[PDB]
Design a protein around this ligand. Sequence first.
Ligand SMILES: [Mg+2]
Length: 145
Amino acid sequence: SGLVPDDEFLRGKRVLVVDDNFISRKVATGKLKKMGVSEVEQCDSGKEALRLVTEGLTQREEQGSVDKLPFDYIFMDCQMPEMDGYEATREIRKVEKSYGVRTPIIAVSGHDPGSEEARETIQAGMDAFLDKSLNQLANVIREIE
Ligand SMILES: [Mg+2]
């Protein structure tokens, strides 16, 4: 848990889980479901998250959707081959400019960040940081809200 400078807890929410590890992804997904999340989407890479976010935002804009964000929260694995979570977050924030929106993006890591990673968390534009146990998932969301 930290911010970056029960079975209905997330009812009504739509979440994207982005993780290169299939078991991690399945574990994040099930924890979110046990919180009453209405919709979890999963993908296995930074480039796929970017695609799903860029399409979802264009769609809702074109349709004049009441909700403009395709996902209420994104859980973004930090270390991934090719496009890591910092780079994906960064590009999503570039894409969101045109729309005047901002999706809550939560960095997920199996260790505490070092100073280089910490610097990246902020420059990428992440809102928060969580350990992969997801023990603090709810406090962080309360904190972001
Ligand atoms: Mg990883």
